Structure formats: structure tokens, C-alpha cells
Ligand binder design. Sequence first.
Ligand SMILES: Nc1nc2c(ncn2[C@@H]2O[C@H](COP(=O)(O)OP(=O)(O)OP(=O)(O)O)[C@@H](O)[C@H]2O)c(=O)[nH]1
Ligand SMILES: Nc1nc2c(ncn2[C@@H]2O[C@H](COP(=O)(O)OP(=O)(O)OP(=O)(O)O)[C@@H](O)[C@H]2O)c(=O)[nH]1
Ligand SMILES: Nc1nc2c(ncn2[C@@H]2O[C@H](COP(=O)(O)OP(=O)(O)OP(=O)(O)O)[C@@H](O)[C@H]2O)c(=O)[nH]1
Ligand SMILES: COc1cc(C(=O)c2nc(-c3ccc(C)c(O)c3)ccc2F)cc(OC)c1OC
Ligand SMILES: COc1cc(C(=O)c2nc(-c3ccc(C)c(O)c3)ccc2F)cc(OC)c1OC
Ligand SMILES: Nc1nc2c(ncn2[C@@H]2O[C@H](COP(=O)(O)OP(=O)(O)O)[C@@H](O)[C@H]2O)c(=O)[nH]1
Ligand SMILES: [Mg+2]
Lengths: 431, 425, 428, 426, 125
Amino acid sequence: MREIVHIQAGQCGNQIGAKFWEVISDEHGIDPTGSYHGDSDLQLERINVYYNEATGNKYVPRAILVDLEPGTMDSVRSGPFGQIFRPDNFVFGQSGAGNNWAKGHYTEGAELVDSVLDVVRKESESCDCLQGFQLTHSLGGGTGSGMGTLLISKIREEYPDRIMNTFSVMPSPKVSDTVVEPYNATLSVHQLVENTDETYCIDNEALYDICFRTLKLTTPTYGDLNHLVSATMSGVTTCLRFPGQLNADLRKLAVNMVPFPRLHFFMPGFAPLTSRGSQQYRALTVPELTQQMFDSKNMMAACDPRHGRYLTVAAIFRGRMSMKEVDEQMLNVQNKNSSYFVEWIPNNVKTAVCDIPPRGLKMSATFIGNSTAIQELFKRISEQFTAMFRRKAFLHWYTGEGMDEMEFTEAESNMNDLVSEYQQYQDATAD
Amino acid sequence: MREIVHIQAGQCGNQIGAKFWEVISDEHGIDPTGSYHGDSDLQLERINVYYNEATGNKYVPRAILVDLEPGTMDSVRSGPFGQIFRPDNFVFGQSGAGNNWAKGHYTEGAELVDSVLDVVRKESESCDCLQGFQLTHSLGGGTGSGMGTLLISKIREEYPDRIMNTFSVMPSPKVSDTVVEPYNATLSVHQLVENTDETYCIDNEALYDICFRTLKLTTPTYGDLNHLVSATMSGVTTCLRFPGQLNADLRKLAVNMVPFPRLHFFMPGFAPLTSRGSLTVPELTQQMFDSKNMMAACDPRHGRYLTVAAIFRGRMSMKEVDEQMLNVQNKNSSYFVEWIPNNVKTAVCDIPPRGLKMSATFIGNSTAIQELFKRISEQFTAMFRRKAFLHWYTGEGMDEMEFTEAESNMNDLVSEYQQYQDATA
Amino acid sequence: MRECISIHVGQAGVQIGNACWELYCLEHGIQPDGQMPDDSFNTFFSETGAGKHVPRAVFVDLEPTVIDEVRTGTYRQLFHPEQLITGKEDAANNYARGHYTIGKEIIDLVLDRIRKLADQCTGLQGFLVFHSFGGGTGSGFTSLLMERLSVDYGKKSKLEFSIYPAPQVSTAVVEPYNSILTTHTTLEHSDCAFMVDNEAIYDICRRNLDIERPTYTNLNRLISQIVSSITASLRFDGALNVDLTEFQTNLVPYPRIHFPLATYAPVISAEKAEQLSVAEITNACFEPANQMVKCDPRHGKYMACCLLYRGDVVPKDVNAAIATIKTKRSIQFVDWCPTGFKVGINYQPPTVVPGGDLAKVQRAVCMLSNTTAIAEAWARLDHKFDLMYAKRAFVHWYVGEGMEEGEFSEAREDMAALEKDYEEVGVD
Amino acid sequence: MRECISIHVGQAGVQIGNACWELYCLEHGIQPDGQMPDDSFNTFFSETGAGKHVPRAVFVDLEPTVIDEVRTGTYRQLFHPEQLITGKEDAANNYARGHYTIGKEIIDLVLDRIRKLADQCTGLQGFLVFHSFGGGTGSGFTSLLMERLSVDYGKKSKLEFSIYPAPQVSTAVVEPYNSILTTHTTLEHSDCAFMVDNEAIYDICRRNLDIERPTYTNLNRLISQIVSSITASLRFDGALNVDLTEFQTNLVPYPRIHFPLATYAPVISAEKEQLSVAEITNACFEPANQMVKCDPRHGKYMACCLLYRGDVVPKDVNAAIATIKTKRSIQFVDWCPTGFKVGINYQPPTVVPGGDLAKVQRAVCMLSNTTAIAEAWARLDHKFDLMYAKRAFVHWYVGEGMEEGEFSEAREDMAALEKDYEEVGV
Amino acid sequence: MEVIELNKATSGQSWEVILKPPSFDGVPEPSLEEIQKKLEAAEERRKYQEAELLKHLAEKREHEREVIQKAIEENNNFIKMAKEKLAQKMESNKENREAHLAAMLERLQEKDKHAEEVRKNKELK
Ligand SMILES: Nc1nc2c(ncn2[C@@H]2O[C@H](COP(=O)(O)OP(=O)(O)OP(=O)(O)O)[C@@H](O)[C@H]2O)c(=O)[nH]1
Ligand SMILES: Nc1nc2c(ncn2[C@@H]2O[C@H](COP(=O)(O)OP(=O)(O)OP(=O)(O)O)[C@@H](O)[C@H]2O)c(=O)[nH]1
Ligand SMILES: Nc1nc2c(ncn2[C@@H]2O[C@H](COP(=O)(O)OP(=O)(O)OP(=O)(O)O)[C@@H](O)[C@H]2O)c(=O)[nH]1
Ligand SMILES: COc1cc(C(=O)c2nc(-c3ccc(C)c(O)c3)ccc2F)cc(OC)c1OC
Ligand SMILES: COc1cc(C(=O)c2nc(-c3ccc(C)c(O)c3)ccc2F)cc(OC)c1OC
Ligand SMILES: Nc1nc2c(ncn2[C@@H]2O[C@H](COP(=O)(O)OP(=O)(O)O)[C@@H](O)[C@H]2O)c(=O)[nH]1
Ligand SMILES: [Mg+2]
């Protein structure tokens, strides 16, 4: 287990993927030229997980960039680190999905997906030991969601034995006014229940609320939101990227975090919460990091963890800190908050420490929960879906592309089935 | 009726065997280079009973050293008298018996036994008139116990007309090496009942009790116990080794000591008792029929003697010796069977054991020896009723039936001893 | 003659093998190149023409990073490359991948190497297998290896050293699953398994060595000392030796009841500012603080006690020490065990890795006891297994690798029966 | 000439043979080398072409220690190697081993050596057989030999001197068995057997010689003086018992009742006035001087001879006989005359120089056939019975090929013998 | 006493002393082959007993081989049963793991056929 293959689709997927690549590149001492300029061997020891070694002592992100809309390819090449990516790994169409899932999943996205699989096979066959794939995309649009799930299915067919992992951005009416986003999100969640192993639930609703209530940004932009996303993505891939005694990979994470195949949607959390590009004038203590981590204000999914129970938890602390103090706080938080952990999965909280803090912080903590409280997110999507579907609002955008009401009914049934399972294990007793 | 071939098997067999050769070499004046430096010809009159006379006027014990483990005989060979043994009379395996009678008797013993029998067969043909075999071994282990009884059986098949005599060390939980001592001993006693002519019951329970109670040794060791075994072995072989008017040999001893073929387990006794490093004739007579001097944990007043053979060593009035032995027989009349007239035979030898001036040694065929076997049987039953540890024996190919039959036979032996204890005239 | 082949599986098994083979080289004066300035150590080291002494051992792991440290560490020339066997993917903490999916691709390599080591033995005693209960390799590949050893070598002795999982120092939430699974499939194939509880070793390193957060190298170095006490009888010219056959005969009253309890003493901080008597260290073996498995023997019954002394220890002192033990009423032996003590004494004192935390001592003792109290450790595992298995939590990862649910309840029933066996043997 | 051949079987037969042949040599002036400065001594000694006088004797012991005692002894030059027959393995105190296992093996060798002695005789009287009751060789081989001598020498007389077991100087717990077995098998084949009770002889030495624990040498020396007195008229030209058949004529009225009681006087300590004829004649009627322990007050005499030796005048013997007739009751059976046959042998009694027996002017040996001697058989039958009821030790005899039924058949014969002694002592 | 002279010789003289005459006037009342037959019979009994001893020891020898053989048979049976058990579960696990991967690719291929029906329904309009 070494090489990960990264795929970013659609506007949101390419935007947070770019940021992801800027952020870990600075952690690993790689500049926009792909040359290493760092000071620590630790930066390079597991660098092949995300980077191919190019001739010339350079490092090329093992990254494939996809969008039906051509414009976002030009935006990335312009952005910082636009010159790091392998030019042949840009796969662009000429017309977007028009925020229409069926266009990304059945029609336009289907006409471009073999072009994508060219690059995916080339990256996959080069790998000495392919961990699997991580995809960044949004569920509310038409490309990242529709073509993005179609891609997952197609990749799963040729690589059924590798781990399939997604960073999936959940729509919120606070951030976008596109009224069909509940449709696209419900259709996509259907696909992700059936076809991925691990999905990080990145909720625009949570991101907006954090920017507005905590960071006090009256009108947060996508750059405000994506600073939360990128901090999270850096933190939840830290153990994949840096050498520890844990020797983490995507499969060991799945095996321990997912007790039931469908219940594979993680609620990520982060501390400290910061604004982008802003000096931090005081560090956070280890008890501060531990407490503020399991606090609903720090969750990237708009869910109160105190409304549910954790099935499993994985936490990573970054910076130079007493691992003894970290062991103490983490054990205490579980003893004092005992009622928020299912009692029928013993020792269901795992903690790692990484001495290398992210840029701008002396210490930080990142949290990957499998909490039954995530049903709140799916109930919210479901309620919005139904409000529209009762009226058959906008269905002709979808049937004009060949779909059928039955597909909507099924994906709604399948998501309500997912809500019930969360509830079933939330009420389950050890006795 | 000249030569005895001596065999020692397993750890215990080789430890008391080596101490035996150490002791009698001192009496016959043989130093560890086989050279004689004694002051009397009495030491050399019958020295060929146990020693071969090698070229160079050196005496080599007629001893064969056997074990399935190389450790023990390595230690023997480095012992004080280690050099005295013929180097090709060491026969030793490599992979041990695992404290398992089944291993010593069936699997590992068979692979080494014919190498032993070749060295026995060569010592035998160098004999003018082979008197028989003396074996030293324990019954609680795997090598001396399991392979020693396989040795006896095979020796009996090859020399059916030669006396078989064993010094058989009995286990007790007071001085244990392995948890399966009750199995190993019960399976061996079956064998000895069938295939030996005389067995001296050396009881580790008795030796521990003698050291602790009489000699005041708070924590007995094997050295302490083996000092009592060497005194005893020197005592019951004196008549075989030194010229007397008895001209003692193994067959004559068996004939007068064994009224019934199965009842051939002797209770040895010695007086005075001594601890390592550190007396009248009437006392020797009595102290010899006293439970504190028995090498079997059995009270002779708990049964009756069928036959007794006693030997007094040192300068002493054989009139006074004979007077006192008669007085003891008449005072204790109810502990000899009335239907074997004159069943105590006394011999004297002028030469005392080293360090003593007067000693007496006792060989008793007592019905009280049933106590020794009842103790083994109870320990056997306690384990075998739960089939504990049995799988290490069935794994070797043994049937459970072998276990029950060997104990039925030892319970029969106890019954038989009882029957003669209640016999009247 | 009398050779023993050691096999080290997965991370735990390999890293402990490092502590053991380091200790063995230091005990016998072997340098990390195998050269050397009492021949019994030949049971564990073969010798090449150039006088190089190569351990009789295989190192196996399904992923290469742990064994790569051996390949580049201090003792990288102590082993032949062919003894250090690695694949490219680990079992991902999944028994089913260690035993099937991943493990089947390297199992034939391992048995070919073992077969080659067996061919260098004139009297093979048995195999020593070191593994964790909890790892996917530790459990699943060891089960497979044990099954294949039984086909290749029949009833030839197989003893394990197994790392029982502790939440304090753990890896995976599914470890109770892997533990029950490997124990089931392995039960029929092992003759004797010495279990080691990471929580117990962890607690000893805290209380006796004043190490706040003990690391694996702390745990492993202590664990190496216990292992060495056991094998010292097979590697040295000793007064009272105990071979592999003697361990099994004296400690295992029933095929399934083959999990003796280890206890070691003294455990002294190397930075402590009086040499303990033969009696003191003997009494320490019956205190629960020095047990390698957390359980309460005073609330169980002993079925056999094997006491392995090393160093400056005289037999009269053992006999006096053990006689005291036979008079403590808190030390209860079963009714069907008339005599339960076996004693061995090797005279070379214990050896300590310089720059380690354990102090040099003039005498030490390791007790191996078969107590019914070990069942308490089996009960602790079964309860964690039952918590998750009632909801079929994580089972899908095992079914996905081709296992069937029936294998889980059949393994849990075998542990039920095992628990009921420890009850039965303790009755009167 | 009237040659007699002496056969010594087992350790007791041989060591007493030494004691006798030594005393004969002293009595006849035969030095240990065989040389010599009345011709009746030729009945017991032959002569070689070198001038050496050689005992007419064959020694048999299946154990070389006792016969090497002759090959190397003081009188070793008297014997030719062919008179000394040995083997490697004795009877192990086992009649069955002596009779059946060894006996079948050496009988033809032994009989052949006796034939070489007998071919040198112009008028062989018969054989004088010396052996123990108790040893396996003495009992077992002797009885086989007597069977064979009755076949190869049908009309020749055979006299035994049998050592009767004593617990005081015993060897073996099984001597009662061997005693009854050999007595059964030999009874038909012996004309006259002089028993020597080891307890009687032991008592005479303690009481009359002041020896606290007599050796076999003490006992054998005294036994020699008795055998000497019984044979003195065969080796000198005497007048009573001048040939072997005259022993059964004078002492054995009934063939089975052929166990006379021998009484000897005087026994005087060397380290310690010459007794009169009356004094030593009185001593023949004291049971403390009998060779076998029994009470003559409990039986009747059938025959009684007084063998005087040394300075003895008939005048004094008749007066000694008349004195005891007046004071004492001496009961003979009804069919036999009450009286004595008296013989005087002028040759003086002789002792081994340096021995414990003092030299005496005159001595006497009374041979009487009383029914009292059946008490000795009763003692042996009781011990035999005590053991045989429980079949004790019998398996050692069965193991040598003897059938259990021989034990009872032998014991029935002894029961018949006791009833015979009762019948005649009515 | 009636004395009666018997004889007179060189070294001796003998007579007979008679105290009372008897009360009663008068006196009241194996071949070589048989021997060798009896010695031979005892030898054949000795030899018969030795032969029966050696027969019982020979019976022990055969049992010892039978024990040794039983253990070799048990070890062989242990091997044969471990071999068939292990091959059984390795083939069962293979079939299972293959049947899972086939079901999972089957479901994805149904999705593929559905996509074709969606794209056809579109051109229908
Ligand atoms: N957090 C975050 N969300 C974004 C970003 N860009 C778009 N979104 C959200 O993504 C959803 C819209 O999907 P897009 O990514 O713009 O759509 P697409 O995948 O490119 O599909 P088409 O534009 O129709 O071709 C809405 O919910 C937006 O709020 C971004 O940069 N960061
Ligand atoms: N005592 C000790 N225990 C260890 C060590 N390493 C791992 N463990 C324990 O072993 C268990 C984890 O299984 P591992 O052996 O590390 O895993 P593996 O056998 O390599 O198998 P996979 O990694 O799943 O393929 C946990 O309970 C750890 O505490 C070690 O070095 N010493
Ligand atoms: N008077 C006397 N009795 C003896 C002498 N030697 C042995 N006896 C007695 O004879 C009996 C023993 O039988 P032995 O004749 O010595 O033995 P053996 O005939 O050689 O037969 P085995 O030795 O049994 O083969 C015992 O009662 C002895 O006391 C002796 O020299 N003089
Ligand atoms: C990529 O992000 C991570 C991955 C891993 C593992 O890959 C990994 N996880 C486990 C584990 C996880 C959860 C539970 C409840 C458990 O018992 C064990 C075991 C071994 C592993 F390698 C671990 C992390 O932190 C602990 C990560 O960062 C938060
Ligand atoms: C080997 O040690 C000895 C051997 C013998 C005899 O070999 C031997 N024993 C007997 C004998 C034995 C017992 C009884 C009851 C009996 O009536 C006779 C007879 C002749 C012998 F040659 C004798 C010993 O002392 C008496 C010995 O030492 C104790
Ligand atoms: N008296 C005595 N008993 C011993 C000695 N050594 C071992 N034993 C006993 O022997 C038994 C163990 O058998 P052992 O001879 O050591 O095993 P083996 O070598 O397989 O035959 C136990 O009952 C111990 O009591 C010793 O030197 N003296
Ligand atoms: Mg691993």
C-alpha cells in the first residue's frame, strides 16, 4: 500500500483539489516547479503516496483533473501550482453539466469518461502498490456529482480490489441558490452508498456557519470555505503522508472505522478553527485541542455529535506535544462523555500523533468520526428533496436527458433507508 | 557365578551408579586411573565380580552407562572417578525421553536399545561364568524407568537363565522432578514384577525423611539422599565382593529370599545412619529392625518378614552378633512368619566401610512393602481417574488398557503381600 | 542435534525476534556478523564454513517495512537474505487477508525456507512461533503457517509465544475478532502456547522500571528476557535442563489446556540505587504483579509449576524456597496433581542489553504455571468478541475476503467449550 | 585286600574329607608328599610306581573354590588331578539343581572316575559317601550318584556319612526341603548311614573344648576322630567291623532302619589325668556325647557296638559294662538280645598336632541303632511341613524340572519311616 | 554276664557281652533306563518352561512393534486430515471471494446497461 491516485472533478472538486495540492506541497517542501526545497527527510520518506518521481529530481502530483466545463482547467493552470500538474492529466470537455446530474452521469459525462480512464489507467499501472483512489467533488452540481459518481463506478469495475475514497461537498442553501441541488445530492449519495469505502462528508452548511458565526465573516466566499476544507484534507491525510509507527493506509482506516459497509460517511472535525491567511497569536493547549475537537462548532458536517453516538473515532494531533498528555485527555474525554460512544464496539477511539504541525499553527488536531448523528445531514437533504419532488419541480431537466421518475424514487428510498440504519445503531443496546 | 554386569540408565540411575563405583573403588583400593593401591589382598580376591582386569594391571568396572540424554554422562565422565569407565561402554542418545515412560519404553528406547545390548553382549562374553545383571535406575522418569524396563525384558530374552537384580528408586512428591511420576512408576512396577529376580526398593520418600528427621538436614538435596543410597549399595553387595565362608552370589540370595516368585521386592536397611561430612552390637541388631533405618517408607512392624539377610561389617564378636540377632528374633517373634523356620541369616565381614568401624546392613522381604505400592497406587489413581497427562502417552501409541492392567497388577501384588501377612500355621 | 527452529510472524513477532536474537548473540558472544572469538548454542545457530553462526530462524511479514529495518539494521548480516521473507501488502489488520487473500501468495515461499532449515537439522526438536493475536498477519498467516507445519511435519512439536492484546497499547478495534479466529484454527495444531499480555508487560515497565510511556522496545526487551529464560535450558550446558519435550509433558495435562502462565523475577530498574535471594525471587513468581497475563491465580487452581532458575542459584536454595511454597494455602493445586513442581537451573547469569532499562542481576527465575486462572483472560476476549459480533460489526470485511459467518460462531463455540474445559478441570 | 573307595560330594563332604585324609595320613605315617617310611592301610591308599601312597578317593564340588582348597592344600601332593572333579556353577542350595540340572551333566564324568579307582581293586568292598543333607550339591548330586552306584555296583556296600543341618551353623532356609528330598531318594540305595548333627558337634566343641564359636575346622576335626574310629578296623588289622558288610550285620537288622547313633568319648581340650575305661564307657551312655541329638530314653536299641581304641584291656571293659547294667536301664527290643559287641583296636588315638583336641591314652566310639534317632527325622519333617503347606520356595525346584509331586512323595516316605521306627520300638 | 569271644587279630581283639537273651525267639518281619528316563523328563519340563518364557517375551516384542506402528499411523492420519481440511477451506474461501467479486462486477454491469437505456430514452425524445 503506497500510491494513491487523486481525481478532482467539476468546479468545486478542482478548486478544493488545487488547494489540497498547494497545502501538502508546502508541507512536503515541493514548490510550483515540482522541485524539493525542504529541510527534513521526513518530508520525502512517504512522498510517493501522492507524487510520482519525474526525471530531473522533480515531483509530479499523481493527480487527474476533470471537468465538462473547459473554464476550470484554465483557472487551475493560472492558480499557484498550476504548473506542477502533469499537462497530459487535464481532461476537459467543452460544455458543462448545467448543474444537471443526468448530464454528468448519463450523457455529457459519459462521452468524456473514457478520456479520463486513459489517464487513470496510466497512473494506476505505474504504481508499485496501488492503495486506491481519492476523489474531490461536490454533490450539488452536475459534473463533480454526476460524472464524478459515474467515474467511481467505472474505476471500481477495473480496480474492484482497491480502496475508493471521496471528499464529497454537501450543498447548502446558505451557500448556493441552485434549487435542484437536493436532487443531485440525493442521486449522488445513492451512488456513494453502493460504490465507495470511505467518504468524508464536507458540508457547505457547516462551512458557512463556521465562517459566519465563529470567524465572523459577514459574507464568506468560496475561498473562506475552502480554507476550512484544505485544513481538514491536510489533517485527515497526515498519517498517509508522514512516517509514523502506525504506518497508516486507506485500507486499515476503512477496516477499523466502518463497522457496516453502507455506514461509511465520516464527520470530520478540526481544531483550531482559523481564518485564511491570518496570523495566530496564541497556540492551543492539548486539553483545548481535545475538547474543542469533539465540539459541534468544529465539525465540518452540520451535525451535533451530541445528538448521536460515535461508532468509531480516529484522531490525529500535529505538533510537538506530550503524547502522555494526549493519551490522558483523549481517555478522559471518553470516560466523561461515555454516553456518546456505542458500548458494543470496545475501545472504539484511536489516536495518533505527528510531530510536524501544519503551516501557520504550532499545534492542531483533526478528528474523523463515524457518528450516527450524520443522519441529520441526510435528513436535511431528504427534506429538501421531498419538498421539490412532491411537486415534481424541475423533473424535466432530468427526464429530458433520458431519466425516469423511478430513479428519483429509488434514490430517495435508499437515502431514507440510510437514515434508518444510523437510527437503528444509535438506539441499539449492548444488552 | 563370578561376574556381574552392571548397567545404569537415565539421570538417577547414572548418579547413584557413579556414586556406587566411587564407593566400592575406595574399599577395593582402586584409584580413578584403574590402578590398585590397597593394603590387603582381601580387596582383590573377588574383585573380578565387578571389575575387568585390563592390560597394564588396571581394573575397569564392568559397567555400562546408558541415557537418552548426553548431559548426564558428560557430567559422570567429568566426575571424580569419571575416567575409570571404559570409554566405549558409554551408550547415549541425543533427544531425551521427556520424562515419559512411553518414550523410554517404546519409541526413543527402541532406537537406542540394540546399541546397549551390543555393549552388554560384549561384556558378557568376556566372562568366565556370568552370574547376572544389576541395573540402577529410577522409576519416576522416562529413561531409567521406560528404557530400563525395556532393557530388562530384552536382557531376559537373551539370557533367560541369568539372575536379574535391580536397584529401583521410588518417587515421592517430597523429591520430585516430574508431575507424571505416578504413571511412570506404576508402568515400571508391572515390568519389575514380571522380569526381575531381586529388586531393592530404594524409596526417595524414605531417604528424604531420613535426612530431614534423623540427620536434621533442614533441606535435603540429592547429594544427601545419594549418600544413603551409596551406603546401602555398598552394604548389600559386601558379600558378593569380599571372600566369606558364605561364598555369596545372586542366585543363592534369590533362592533363600524369594519364597514366591512375584514377592521379590526387598526392603533395605542400614545402621548407623550418617550425614555427609560428619555404635554397639546390641544397638546394630535393634536399629536394623527399626523404621527409622529403612530405605523404603514402610514400617516393618506393620507387617511380617518372610526372610531377612543381614550383614555386619567391622571387627566384632560374631558370638555377640549371633546372640543379639537371636534375642531380636524371639522378642519380635510376631513380626516373622511362623511358617518359614529360621528365616534370618547373618553374615560378617571384617572390613568396615570407609569412615566407619562398625556397620550393619539389612535386606528384608517384608509384607509391609505393600505400603510402598499402595502409596504409588493412590497417586496413580488420583491422576488416572481424571485421565490427566494421559495424552502424552496415547500419543506414543499406548492404549489406556496398558495403564489399567499395570495397576491391576500392582494392586494384585499388594493383595498377595496381604495374603501372606495373614497366613498362619 | 536437538535443533529448534524459530519462526517470527508479522510486526509483533518480528520485532520481538529482534530483541531475542540480539539477546542470544550477547548471551553467546556472537557478533552481529555472526563471528565468535559449551557448544549447546548450536541448537539455535547453524555454522557456515567461515565460522559464521546463522540463527535457525525465519522472519515473515506480509509487508516489508518492519523487516527492512532488520535488512538495514545492526544485525543485517546476521541472517541470510533468504530467511527474511516479505510480501508487498499487509493484511490490513484482517485475519482473513493474512490467512487467505494476501497470505496464500507467500505461504509456499515460507515453507520452502523452513524445509531448507529442517534439512540442516540432525534432530529437530520443534518449532517456536512468535506472533500477535491482534494483527492480520499475526493471527491469519500464523494460523495458515501452523496448519501447513502440521501437514509437513506431522506431530512434531509446535510451541507459540503469543501477544495477547491490550487497549493501552493496541492497534485495531477488530483485534478481539482476529484473536478468537486464530485461537480456534490454531488450537489443534499447537502443543503449548505461552501467552503474553501487553497490558501486563506495560504495567510492569511502569511500576518496576519507572517508564512513563513504555515503548515497544521497552516491552520487547522485557519480553526477550522471559523468552531467554525459557530457551536457556536448550542453549546452554546446565545442571538441570528442560527440553521442549519436557515443557509439554510437565505443563499440559490436556491437549486443549496448553496455555501456561509466565512470571518473571526480579525486574529491577537499571537506574535503581541488594541482590535478591533465591527465596525472594521465588516468592515474587506467585505475586500477581509479576504475571505476564493479568489474572488472579489465588482464585484459581494450579495444575503444574515449572521453575526456570538462572545465575547464582544452588539446588539446596531452590528446594528450601519451593518447600515454603508448598505450605502456602493461598497456592492451591488440583486434587488430581500429586506432584506439580519441575525445576531447572542454568548457571550463566541473565544478560542485559547495554543501554536498556533492566538491571544486571546475579540470579533470576522464570516460572511457568498452568493455572485455571488463565481462563479469565479468555473470558475478557470473548466478551469483547460478543459485544461486536451480536451486531455483526466489521464482519463484512471478513466475508468480503471469502470467509463465512459460520466460521465466526464455530470459533466462538470453540472458545465457549475452552472456557468450560477450564471449569471442568478445576473441579474435584 | 578289601579296598574301600571314598566319595566326597559338595563343600561339606570335601572339607570333612580333608580332615579325614589328613588324620589317616597321621595315623599311618604317610607324609604330605605321599611317601612313607601291617598292610591294612592299602584298603584306603593305593600306591604309584614312584612310591607314593594315594587315597582311594574322588572329590566332587561344582564350585572351584572348595576343591582348589585341595589342589593347593598341605596334602595336595596326595591327590591326582583326575580325583578332583569341579565345575563352574554350584547347585545354588537347590536339590533340584544338584540332582536334575547339574547331575544329568556330570554323572557320567564322575562315574567314569570312580570306575578308574574300582578297576585298581582286587576285592572292592564298596563306597564311603560323605555329603551334607542341606546343600543342593550334597543332597541333589549325591542321591543321583547312589542311584547309579546301585546300578553299576549291585552287590557292593554303600555307607554314608551325612551332615545333618543345624540352625546354629546353617547355610540356607531350604535345607529341610533338600534333606527330605535326598533322604527319600537315597533310602533304597544305602546300607548304613552315620548321621552327624551339626548342632550336636557344635555343642560338644563349645562345652568340651572351650571354644565359644566353633569353625568348620573345629567341627571337621572332631568329625574326623569319629570317622577314624568307625574305619580304624578297616585300615588296621582289627577284629570287629573288618569289612563293610559287617556294619549292616552288626548294626542294621532292618534295611530301612539303617541310621545308627554314634557316641564318642573322650573329647578333651588341648590347652587344658588320663581317663579310665569305666569313665569313657560311662560317657557313651550320656546323650551330651551323641553325634545326633535325640533321647535314647525314648527308644529301644536294636544293636550296640563299643569300638575301643588305644590302651584298653578286656578285663576293664567287661567290668565297666557290668557297672552300668546294675545302675542303668538299657532297653533293647524284644526280638534282639540285650548286649554289646566289643572291639578293641590297639592303635592309639591320634590328633592333628596343634589342633584343639588333646592326645588321649584311650578312646571309645559306641555305634548303637536306637529308635530314638527318629526324633531327628521328626524335627526335619516339621520344618518341611511348615513351609510346604504354603508351597514356600517350591517354584525354584519346579523351575529346574522337578515335579511338585516329588515333594509330597518324598514326604510320604518320611512319614512311612517314622511309622517304621514306631512299629519296631513298640 | 555271658561273655563270648569273637576274634583276635594283629591290631585288635573283639568279643560279645550278653546281659539278657531276647524275650522273643526269632526276628519279626530302578534300572539305568528308568533313571535316565526320569532325568530326561525333568529336562524336557525345564526346556518347556524356558520355551514358554521366551514365547511370552516374543509376544511382548510384537506388542512393542504394534505400539510403535500405531503411533506412526496416528501421525499419518493427523497429516491426512490436516491436508484435506486445509485444502477444503482454501478452495471454499477462493470460491466465496470469487463469487463476491463476480456479484459486485455484475451489479456495476447492470448500472452500465441502465445507462444505455437512459441514453436511448433521450434520443427517443
Ligand atoms: N466548498 C466549496 N463548495 C463549492 C465550491 N464551488 C462550488 N461549490 C458548491 O458546489 C455545488 C455546485 O457544484 P459545482 O462544483 O459548481 O458544479 P460542477 O460539478 O462543476 O457541475 P457543472 O458546473 O454543472 O458542470 C454548489 O453546492 C456550490 O455551493 C468551492 O470552491 N468550495
Ligand atoms: N509486545 C509487542 N506487541 C506488539 C508489537 N508490535 C505490535 N504489537 C501488538 O500486536 C498487535 C498488532 O498486530 P501486529 O503484529 O502489529 O500486526 P501484523 O502481525 O504485522 O499484521 P498486519 O499489520 O495487520 O498485516 C497489537 O495488539 C500490538 O500491540 C511489539 O513490537 N511488541
Ligand atoms: N560339619 C560341617 N558341615 C558343613 C561344612 N560345610 C558345609 N556344611 C554344612 O552343609 C550344609 C551346606 O551344604 P554344602 O554341602 O556346604 O553345600 P553344597 O553341597 O556344596 O551345595 P551348593 O553350595 O548349594 O551347590 C550346611 O548345613 C552347612 O552347615 C563343613 O565343613 N563341616
Ligand atoms: C488517514 O488517516 C488516518 C488513518 C489511520 C489508519 O490507517 C489506521 N487506523 C487504525 C484504527 C482506526 C480507528 C479505530 C477505532 C481503530 O481501533 C484503529 C488502525 C491502524 C491504522 F493504520 C489512522 C489515523 O489515526 C488514528 C488516521 O488519521 C486520523
Ligand atoms: C548379596 O548380599 C548377600 C548375599 C547372601 C547370599 O548370597 C546367601 N544367602 C543365603 C540366605 C539368605 C537368606 C536366608 C533367610 C537364608 O536362610 C540364607 C544363603 C547363602 C548365601 F550365599 C547373603 C547375605 O547375608 C546373609 C548377603 O548380604 C546381606
Ligand atoms: N535418590 C535419587 N533420586 C533421583 C536422583 N535423580 C533423580 N531422581 C529421581 O528420579 C526421578 C526422575 O527420573 P530421572 O532419573 O531423573 O529421569 P530419567 O533420566 O529419564 O530416567 C524422580 O523421582 C527423582 O526423585 C538422584 O540423584 N538420587
Ligand atoms: Mg503489519
